[PDB]
Ligand binder design. Sequence first.
Ligand SMILES: [Mg+2]
Ligand SMILES: [Mg+2]
Ligand SMILES: [Mg+2]
Length: 430
Amino acid sequence: GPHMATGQDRVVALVDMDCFFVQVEQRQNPHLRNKPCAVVQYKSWKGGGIIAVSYEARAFGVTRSMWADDAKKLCPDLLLAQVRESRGKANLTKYREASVEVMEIMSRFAVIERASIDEAYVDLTSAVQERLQKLQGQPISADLLPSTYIEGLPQGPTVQKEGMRKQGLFQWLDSLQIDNLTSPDLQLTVGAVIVEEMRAAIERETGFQCSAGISHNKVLAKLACGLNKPNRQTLVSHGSVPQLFSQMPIRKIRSLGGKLGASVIEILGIEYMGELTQFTESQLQSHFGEKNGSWLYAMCRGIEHDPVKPRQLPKTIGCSKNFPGKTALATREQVQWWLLQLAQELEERLTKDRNDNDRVATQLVVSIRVQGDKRLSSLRRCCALTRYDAHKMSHDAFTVIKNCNTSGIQTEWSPPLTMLFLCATKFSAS
DNA sequence: ATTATGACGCT
DNA sequence: AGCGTCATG
Ligand SMILES: [Mg+2]
Ligand SMILES: [Mg+2]
Ligand SMILES: [Mg+2]
């Protein structure tokens, strides 16, 4: 009754750039704009591997993780942009720098959590309180929500998409109680007004379009963001959760798209996230552990407490390269050359990070994969990172991994290495 | 021979 | 610490 908390205490948004690497390339090269186009890494093997796809190209069935030659079978007119190559490897600096552009704009509106290169969570609770104080009880005009969908509406007693969007928005705004400054639905609505403004600012100042979700917590905001892409935002109210979850496959919720979600489905014999409500918190903890069980019990009712962390910068700076099939590194000279290439990219990025952000990394993590290991990482080992010097870092990494060489010969490396990864971690202020 | 990242949990 | 899981541009 009155004591069951409803998880409506915060307003949280998730902003996600649409097809981000494609947009970065389309800004640079106007010939790619409003075209089926994709971004690829490398070229020789099957035309390169696609990592980002414009919505025009998605209409033909082009997806990430598809080889460009195969995508061209689906979409003969597909345009491609290649990721930069430096020191023999893909270099993602252009997209990291574009990400910083966007994150700095978002940070003007609220403190953000950088969830990935192209997405950030926003805690809007305080900004919403402020805007409500300025509103003085004035209703919210639909004109202030020109790209907002209200999930679950319209409902009840036109055949165009924008018409449906506006009917739903109208139903939502008509049912709104604008004099209660503590109404969660009103708070979400003002949150959506702010996110319209943030998305307008991102597009004006960068050229980049994004989608967003507005709800009461991170998981619902992420889910909402995905409901209407691209270039749109979606409000998921607490009240919309029972219907939304009643047909929502468990794998769609962040953290349940892998083994844990599969085990929820198999152990409980259910398919949809709403079906979780029929289990006690202790039942879910018995199957999935204390933490997961409590999380699932609350999440299937729309409630989640994970805070938006005040963190706009990545916690690690890493450099990785796979050496698949026949390109696996089989000589010590080879291993040392590539460790050096990775370490030189790492040094460049670290020195820039130190100048920009007033911090220094203090641990170097070295990870490798050996031929025939099913796992993505075969071995992970840390050592001290005391100097931003590529030759030192690569010599230290070699010292850390050199006992992996099974070869009786010092010149040969066996089993050959199919992946090298250098990562700088544990930053301290400087 | 989907690749290059990045965050976080477990023990 | 080192390993596994989840996300996926
Ligand atoms: Mg995106
Ligand atoms: Mg994203
Ligand atoms: Mg994506």
